[PDB]
Design a binder for this molecule. Structure first.
Ligand SMILES: Cc1cc2nc3c(=O)[nH]c(=O)nc-3n(C[C@H](O)[C@H](O)[C@H](O)COP(=O)(O)OP(=O)(O)OC[C@H]3O[C@@H](n4cnc5c(N)ncnc54)[C@H](O)[C@@H]3O)c2cc1C
Ligand SMILES: Cc1cc2nc3c(=O)[nH]c(=O)nc-3n(C[C@H](O)[C@H](O)[C@H](O)COP(=O)(O)OP(=O)(O)OC[C@H]3O[C@@H](n4cnc5c(N)ncnc54)[C@H](O)[C@@H]3O)c2cc1C
Ligand SMILES: Cc1cccc2c(C[C@H](N)C(=O)O)c[nH]c12
Ligand SMILES: Cc1cccc2c(C[C@H](N)C(=O)O)c[nH]c12
Ligand SMILES: [Mg+2]
Ligand SMILES: [Mg+2]
Lengths: 417, 415
């Protein structure tokens, strides 16, 4: 095939801003840059859709706060991307159990200078009994907070920047916004700048092997339809997540950093109906955290509802789709009934649904706190890695912006000298 | 119960026909059926896309003959699929290399007796020279005729049985049809009737290995979101082509039949125009066969033109597509000008366009006693495919493997 000077692999937010920071630069004046990505679309873990053509839903990333995500807030304005207020940030539908939870929290919280590295299911079970420490906690909606892998210092953070449970830790100041056309509008924007700057895209292709040959690298990719493709570049950035690099011969994670990483599956499922039936309940633009397997239920206006799930519960939900769409849907009807506390047939059926499951949906720095380089180099061949996961904002979109802007710097200095 | 009675892996026309056979025996009145398929929609190599609204185009199988595909035709009827006449039978512009082989090829035809087990290229390299043979073979437009894997016995078969060059063998009377809506229309009908009888589809899952575990079998499949998954079933049919087969823990093809198998890539590219410009050259519903890369060029009423190639020239066009929409679009215009004997400025730029590379477009046969559906010696699995019939590379090959394989199975539920 062809060849290039720079070769970014991965074309989600970290990959595509990576490239645009390498083109804003004159130190790449008239240099050839190629982007490979696996999917037929650009976006990475960001995906937007129209179901029924009625309203624009988001199968992935959906929220940001300017208070907590400055570079992202700026990247929106930078690309004339119109935001809107994100409704799901207060709870009025609880039973008694989710109440009397902010009180248990604002009190046992500074008692964590003696119980901060421990996982979170016994920092709740050492300061009151277990038979009440699995109720205050699966009342907060994310089953991510029951896994041993990650702690009470990292969990007590995580409760404060998720719009639906932040009122619980002195953080209801922040506003949260959503893209008014969807975050694809932010992607189609960065994509156009990079094309106009003369880069060439190659979507459909997956990297398999890398070998370092003199001044540069020999990539072996494989097309979506089998086409075996070979390509050589002097300079290389793999802006893919950490799970993604485990599968390649790069010595991840050992040759690059002194941290390890996990990841949690996620699951979103969307439904729409003929008539906005949940309105009769004063439930539009509000959110319920129930302890049946739906976990969190959202109604955006009179338009649709969805439900968000994580970790194992996410696997559970991905199990009942392997079983059969119809089996998946009537059981949603079932759980929908015990949440709202009505009978099963007061619940209509959906004209059309749509659902998505993420196998490595959020990847995190597991050696939770460290130097936080924000980008990684090979101790040998000088390949730059680039993910949300290498920053203090593991699992958010601003981590992609930061990892990228850092990454592109290490390569500019690695070219110009 | 994450488990079932009968499992069919492969929702090609083979696999789905098996499902349709099986669900009409009364010996299956009360047995559960699972169909697995890698893709997110059934068909396999039948793939129809409504291009720009103002076109219905066939990226895979496109055409059939009532003379060689009667089981297909009866199926097309059995499901009220309206089919149209398929115009690409004559050649208006037969350069007299095409005409030279007309009456050079059909009279060493009894000389093909006591020969014909020999590369086709060295066959025609016996009447006239090498460079007279390659001129005759080039103008037939099927680069697969130059393979050594191919041989002059199959040669007179393949050239006889394609609608654009049948006029050169003696099967010049077969007639050829396409579908009003598309063969997708036909498979949606089988799938509808298979679903309605009670089969359960799990689409988007692909098989990785099979354990022969006791009564039946355990399968490992992997979805395209990455989710892993196990399935136990008692009766398993692999309705997938042989290339696929040779990548599992089943030892193919030695443990099945001894025969070796090969395949061919294929390419098709389509284009769309503001004004149908090829009508002023009286070119609608014609096909030009050419000695350049495009190879075969079709003009479809006033709707679209496309071109079609295989073997080396499919690999050449997949390799070009890989180097940018810009060059592929440009070489295409370069070679269309040579085809019509004009300058490239008379050829407008297209509005839309689409293309498909099939890595293993047609799979073929190459013991000469082979049934229409294979079986494992050791684990009692049955395989179902166009490739194990007298019709390898055709859809009717699929139907005659399904009816063979599906019956090979009631033979074993009457255990
Ligand atoms: C359900 C869900 C909700 C989320 N909500 C939010 C939110 O509200 N706010 C927020 O800030 N973040 C959110 N996120 C996180 C956000 O999506 C990611 O952190 C961010 O988009 C990651 O950007 P990235 O470009 O580095 O990686 P990715 O988005 O993973 O992009 C990686 C790209 O590299 C590609 N790639 C991988 N491997 C290979 C290979 N071998 N060859 C070729 N190509 C390859 C991938 O296909 C992908 O295109 C959410 C995530 C999920 C799953
Ligand atoms: C470009 C092209 C043009 C053609 N034109 C014509 C024509 O005009 N007339 C004609 O008669 N024939 C034509 N054919 C051939 C015809 O389409 C095929 O011979 C026939 O469709 C084969 O069907 P099948 O059911 O045997 O398997 P396939 O159609 O090959 O389908 C097999 C199915 O199994 C699935 N599958 C495979 N492997 C695995 C695995 N490991 N795990 C899980 N799932 C799996 C595949 O996704 C596929 O859906 C054409 C073929 C091509 C490529
Ligand atoms: C347990 C856990 C750890 C990191 C991330 C998540 C998300 C999704 C992401 N935090 C978001 O909603 O933006 C849900 N659960 C998580
Ligand atoms: C080399 C070879 C062997 C058998 C079959 C085919 C087809 C299929 C046929 N041309 C069609 O599209 O109808 C194309 N090439 C073939
Ligand atoms: Mg990326
Ligand atoms: Mg099949």
């Amino acid at each position: 095939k062809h060849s290039s000077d720079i070769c970014i692999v991965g074309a989600g937010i970290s990959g595509l801003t990576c490239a645009s920071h390498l083109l804003d630069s004159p130190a790449c004046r008239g240099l050839s840059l190629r982007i490979f990505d696996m999917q037929q679309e650009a976006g990475g873990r960001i995906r937007s859709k129209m179901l029924d053509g009625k309203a624009s839903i988001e199968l992935g990333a959906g929220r940001y706060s300017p208070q907590l995500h400055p570079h992202f807030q700026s990247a929106m304005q930078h690309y004339s991307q119109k935001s809107e207020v994100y409704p799901f940030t207060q709870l009025k539908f609880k039973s008694h159990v989710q109440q009397k939870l902010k009180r248990a929290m604002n009190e046992l919280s500074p008692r964590l200078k003696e119980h901060g590295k421990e996982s979170f299911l016994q920092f709740v079970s050492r300061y009151q009994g277990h038979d009440s420490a699995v109720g205050m906690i699966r009342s907060m909606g994310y089953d991510a907070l029951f896994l041993p892998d990650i702690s009470a210092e990292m969990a007590y953070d995580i409760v404060g920047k998720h719009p639906e449970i932040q009122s619980v830790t002195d953080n209801d100041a922040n506003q949260w916004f959503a893209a008014e056309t969807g975050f694809a509008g932010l992607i189609q924007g960065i994509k156009a700048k990079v094309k106009a700057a003369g880069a060439r895209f190659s979507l459909g292709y997956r990297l398999l092997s890398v070998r370092t040959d003199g001044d540069g690298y020999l990539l072996q990719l494989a097309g979506d339809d089998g086409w075996k493709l070979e390509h050589r570049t002097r300079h290389l950035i793999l802006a893919i997540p950490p799970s993604a690099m485990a599968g390649l011969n790069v010595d991840f994670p050992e040759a690059w950093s002194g941290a390890r990483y996990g990841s949690l599956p996620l699951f979103k499922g969307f439904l729409t109906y003929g008539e906005p039936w949940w309105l009769d309940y004063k439930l539009d633009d509000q959110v319920l955290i129930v302890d049946n397997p739906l976990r969190k239920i959202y109604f955006k206006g009179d338009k649709y509802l969805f439900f968000y799930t994580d970790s194992e519960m996410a696997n559970y939900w991905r199990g009942c789709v392997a079983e059969g769409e119809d089996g998946y849907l009537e059981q949603i009807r079932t759980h929908l009934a015990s949440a709202l506390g009505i009978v099963r047939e007061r619940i209509p059926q959906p004209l059309a649904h749509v659902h998505k499951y993420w196998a490595h949906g959020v990847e995190f720095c597991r050696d939770s706190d460290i130097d936080h380089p924000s980008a990684l180099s090979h101790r040998d061949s000088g390949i730059i890695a680039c993910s949300d996961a290498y920053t203090e904002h593991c699992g958010w979109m601003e981590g992609g912006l930061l990892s990228a802007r850092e990454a592109s710097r290490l390569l500019l200095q690695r070219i110009a000298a």
